[PDB]
């Protein structure tokens, strides 16, 4: 049950650094506690700020501003492989930014056997222009001629008397 | 003394033994429907709906 | 004891109201409010004696 949590944090003020800078980023975490722990690890990678050296100031979840309108989302991700250094960027069409994020995690966990710790969300953006779309499958989902039969029909009440029609 | 353990939550009579306040609580209180002052900083919304 | 229960409930409800009002104001004028660090946690043992 992922949800997009905004995290703002800063280092502990002291006589050397009376006013710390405000660092804010949007990350997808299933709960507040996961979000805060991920934020600290990200800051250690980038700014090298320890948990004791700093403190979180505000945590807030972001709903989809237009959850009822279909959109296309492009995410840039760096993934750890046998070499431990890989980068990818993917596009998905979904009605919720979290829905896009959890969709990519499943795809990463299937194609590359990707773990939550290994994956780091680099960039999130909204795809709106038709020419911006690059992947072939979403391109097929973009043209107005989208029409096809329902795939994977297959539709305890065991021992059904008649043969199933399995048609229209 | 205290042959059995009776739950203060489950048993209302033991609650009166331990809580000489449970007689008057009225836990639910109407603290709304009074022209609610929607509180949200405009710049807070701007930084919320970014990237 | 009954009166001390009145004061405690009033203290608890005021504390919750103050904290909620504290965050509403900060969100209203844009400043960020960090809540006070808790002093009480409840620990639960999860691993046996082996």
């Amino acid at each position: 049950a992922l949800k997009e949590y905004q995290v703002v944090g800063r280092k502990v003020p002291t006589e050397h650094e009376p006013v710390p800078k405000l660092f804010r980023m949007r990350l997808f975490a299933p709960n507040e506690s996961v979000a805060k722990s991920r934020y600290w690890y990200f800051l250690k990678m980038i700014n090298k700020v320890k948990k004791a050296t700093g403190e979180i100031v505000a945590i807030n979840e972001i709903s989809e501003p237009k959850p009822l309108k279909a959109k296309v989302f492009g995410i840039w991700i760096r993934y750890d492989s046998r070499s431990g250094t890989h980068n990818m960027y993917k596009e998905f069409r979904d009605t919720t930014r979290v829905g896009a994020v959890e969709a990519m995690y499943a795809d990463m966990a299937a194609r590359h056997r990707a773990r939550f710790r290994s994956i780091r969300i680099l960039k999130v953006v909204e795809v709106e222009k038709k020419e911006d779309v690059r992947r072939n499958y979403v391109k097929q989902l973009l043209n107005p001629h989208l029409k096809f039969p329902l795939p994977h029909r297959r539709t305890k009440k065991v021992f059904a008397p008649h043969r199933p029609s399995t048609f229209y | 003394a205290h042959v059995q353990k009776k739950n203060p939550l489950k048993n209302k009579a033991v609650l009166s033994r331990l809580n000489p306040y449970a007689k008057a609580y009225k836990a639910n209180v109407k603290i709304n429907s009074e022209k609610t002052p929607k509180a949200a900083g405009e710049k807070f919304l701007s930084v919320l709906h970014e990237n | 004891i009954a009166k001390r229960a009145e004061a405690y409930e009033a203290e608890y409800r005021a504390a919750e109201r103050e904290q909620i009002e504290l965050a509403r104001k900060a969100r209203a004028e844009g400043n960020y409010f960090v809540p006070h660090e808790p002093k009480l946690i409840f620990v639960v043992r999860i691993r046996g004696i082996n």
């Binding site: 703002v8 800063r10 006013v19 710390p20 800078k21 405000l22 660092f23 804010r24 980023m25 990200f42 800051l43 990678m45 980038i46 700014n47 100031v57 840039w76 760096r78 980068n87 780091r120 969300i121 680099l122 960039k123 | 930084v47 970014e50 990237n51 | 904290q19 504290l22 900060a26 844009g30 400043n31 960020y32 409010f33 960090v34 809540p35 006070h36």
Partner: peptide, 18 residues
């Protein structure tokens, strides 16, 4: 509990380095 100010210290977005 202390009000952390934001004047002249607006939050800055950071994203992981590729």
């Amino acid at each position: 509990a202390h009000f952390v100010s934001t004047e002249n210290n607006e939050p800055v977005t950071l994203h992981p380095v590729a």
